[PDB]
Amino acid sequence: KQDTFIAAVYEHAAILPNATLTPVSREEALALMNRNLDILEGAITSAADQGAHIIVTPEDAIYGWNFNRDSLYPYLEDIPDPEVNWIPCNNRNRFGQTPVQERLSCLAKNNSIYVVANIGDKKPCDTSDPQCPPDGRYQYNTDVVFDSQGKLVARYHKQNLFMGENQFNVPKEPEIVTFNTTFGSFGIFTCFDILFHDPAVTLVKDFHVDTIVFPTAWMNVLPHLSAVEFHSAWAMGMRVNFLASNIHYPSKKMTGSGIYAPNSSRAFHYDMKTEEGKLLLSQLDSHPSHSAVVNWTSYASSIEALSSGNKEFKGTVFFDEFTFVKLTGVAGNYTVCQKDLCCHLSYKMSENIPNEVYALGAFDGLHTVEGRYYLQICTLLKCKTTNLNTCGDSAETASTRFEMFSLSGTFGTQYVFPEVLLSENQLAPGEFQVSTDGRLFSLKPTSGPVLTVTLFGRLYEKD
Ligand SMILES: *[C@@H]1O[C@H](CO)[C@@H](O[C@@H]2O[C@H](CO)[C@@H](O)[C@H](O)[C@H]2NC(C)=O)[C@H](O)[C@H]1NC(C)=O
Ligand SMILES: *[C@@](O)(CCNC(=O)[C@H](O)C(C)(C)CO)Cc1ccccc1
Numbered sequence: 530k531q532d533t534f535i536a537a538v539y540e541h542a543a544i545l546p547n548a549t550l551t552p553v554s555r556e557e558a559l560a561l562m563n564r565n566l567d568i569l570e571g572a573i574t575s576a577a578d579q580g581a582h583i584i585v586t587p588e589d590a591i592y593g594w595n596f597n598r599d600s601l602y603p604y605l606e607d608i609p610d611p612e613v614n615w616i617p618c619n620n621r622n623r624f625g626q627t628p629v630q631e632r633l634s635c636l637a638k639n640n641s642i643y644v645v646a647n648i649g650d651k652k653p654c655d656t657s658d659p660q661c662p663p664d665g666r667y668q669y670n671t672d673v674v675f676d677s678q679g680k681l682v683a684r685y686h687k688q689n690l691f692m693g694e695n696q697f698n699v700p701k702e703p704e705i706v707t708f709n710t711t712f713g714s715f716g717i718f719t720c721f722d723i724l725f726h727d728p729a730v731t732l733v734k735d736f737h738v739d740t741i742v743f744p745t746a747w748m749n750v751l752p753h754l755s756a757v758e759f760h761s762a763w764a765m766g767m768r769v770n771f772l773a774s775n776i777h778y779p780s781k782k783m784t785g786s787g788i789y790a791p792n793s794s795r796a797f798h799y800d801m802k803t804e805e806g807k808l809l810l811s812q813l814d815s816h817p818s819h820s821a822v823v824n825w826t827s828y829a830s831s832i833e834a835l836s837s838g839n840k841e842f843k844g845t846v847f848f849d850e851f852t853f854v855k856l857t858g859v860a861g862n863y864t865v866c867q868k869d870l871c872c873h874l875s876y877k878m879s880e881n882i883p884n885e886v887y888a889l890g891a892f893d894g895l896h897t898v899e900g901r902y903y904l905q906i907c908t909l910l911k912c913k914t915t916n917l918n919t920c921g922d923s924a925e926t927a928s929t930r931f932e933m934f935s936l937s938g939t940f941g942t943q944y945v946f947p948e949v950l951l952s953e954n955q956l957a958p959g960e961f962q963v964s965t966d967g968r969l970f971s972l973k974p975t976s977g978p979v980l981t982v983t984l985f986g987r988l989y990e991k992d
């Protein structure tokens with residue numbers, strides 16, 4: 530047992546297979562995957578050379594995301610259950626046709642570092658299995674973890690597939706996967722999983738993991754679902770360490786990797802301008818200590834409305850119709866409600882920028898586009914233009930700094946993720962805090978202009 534460790538995550542500019550009309554050969558698939566593994570090896574060795582205990586690499590980092598069932602097939606391997614007790618590097622012939630697992634095992638062993646990666650699983654089946662797909666096998670999006678001896682210690686099949694992941698199957702039941710180390714208990718899940726209850730919430734609530742490792746290939750959607758923004762907020766809301774390893778592909782708005790602790794981001798990377806990968810390291814506590822449990826409706830339910838006779842308007846945020854009120858002065862106090870959710874904001878801007886409009890919004894309803902999930906959100910955000918019809922649209926930059934803010938709401942859930950995002954998609958580590966009574970508030974003037982301050986709530990039972 531050790532009290533701290535060094536975490537590493539790598540943002541990877543993947544080598545994508547070329548567009549072809551029919552499946553490539555096993556041999557071609559393996560040659561491509563090995564070209565990606567050559568680059569990941571560079572990151573793994575560099576991290577180990579700086580004393581890292583664990584490194585995470587991204588979802589689809591080894592073969593990309595452009596597949597149907599058949600074009601994916603040659604990239605797949607049969608990945609056994611870790612209960613078999615297998616070190617591929619030391620016993621390479623135990624299960625045949627497993628060169629990717631072998632190389633990952635050797636990378637972990639030779640650099641004595643835990644290695645988290647995402648590859649593809651195939652599970653052959655018969656018609657005797659009533660669930661067996663017509664084409665004779667299951668295909669899974671699969672995280673694998675190898676320990677510092679090269680032993681396979683975790684295998685996780687992605688539960689919540691994103692629209693367009695037609696090449697993979699959904700597992701029969703959600704797989705709750707953990708692995709224990711000398712530097713804490715770890716849980717694992719993948720990209721889209723972060724928006725759902727199973728396995729993500731269960732790992733924290735039932736299995737009490739200290740840290741999440743998180744391969745992802747996330748497409749950023751402002752104002753609330755940029756990777757570094759939402760991932761760091763989830764970590765703070767769930768009170769776990771969080772190691773997010775993302776694909777680097779600006780063409781599809783993929784960039785946003787980091788290492789996040791319960792109180793704050795520790796390192797983050799965002800880059801839409803280059804095609805470079807990036808390795809991040811940071812120290813973390815093996816067993817983070819926590820403050821008291823946050824009651825998200827406590828302060829909000831205790832006060833009278835901060836404003837009345839609001840001039841309210843409708844605005845669209847990522848396809849959801851929020852109820853907004855405009856912030857008129859350089860300082861103010863507003864309350865706005867939609868159905869069961871009332872949202873309260875107190876603020877003071879550093880300067881009124883005349884052509885820049887900010888609004889406070891509330892949403893309480895079911896999201897349906899690109900996925901189905903129930904939301905309660907209170908948001909302060911920079912409107913894209915001066916027109917109120919653009920409040921909620923994607924806004925990349927702003928000029929208004931804030932001297933103070935305090936946001937809260939009457940949430941009917943205890944799963945709330947506190948987000949703060951500054952202009953140019955920068956996080957604000959150490960500049961804000963969450964109180965026990967559910968207030969997201971500033972500790973000092975913001976170091977840069979504000980894109981949003983948001984409390985993003987999930988009511989999993991209403992999905
Ligand atoms: C209404 O908003 C104002 C900000 O414009 C709040 O003012 C307080 O400002 C002082 C600065 O001297 C801070 O110390 C406090 O932190 C601010 N408010 C807090 C903590 O609530 C004012 O309090 C707001 N009204 C409320 C909350 O009823
Ligand atoms: C990944 O699961 C995609 C998840 N989708 C997003 O990042 C999406 O932009 C939001 C933020 C969840 C909004 O709906 C993996 C993936 C990557 C590429 C293609 C398909 C799936």
Ligand SMILES: *[C@@H]1O[C@H](CO)[C@@H](O)[C@H](O)[C@H]1NC(C)=O
Nearest residue numbers: 544545546547548557560561
């Ligand atoms: C894709 O084709 C280009 C051009 O011939 C080639 O340089 C590259 O190596 C190819 N990649 C793969 C995976 O075949």
Ligand SMILES: *[C@@H]1O[C@H](CO)[C@@H](O)[C@H](O)[C@H]1NC(C)=O
Nearest residue numbers: 632633634635636637639640
């Ligand atoms: C592991 O190191 C040994 C050194 O002899 C060698 O067999 C192999 O090339 C190495 N593999 C990796 C992936 O580092």
Ligand SMILES: *[C@@H]1O[C@H](CO)[C@@H](O)[C@H](O)[C@H]1NC(C)=O
Nearest residue numbers: 824825826827828830831943
């Ligand atoms: C949270 O606070 C509200 C209002 O103060 C109270 O009614 C509720 O019982 C509290 N819930 C928990 C779980 O502490």
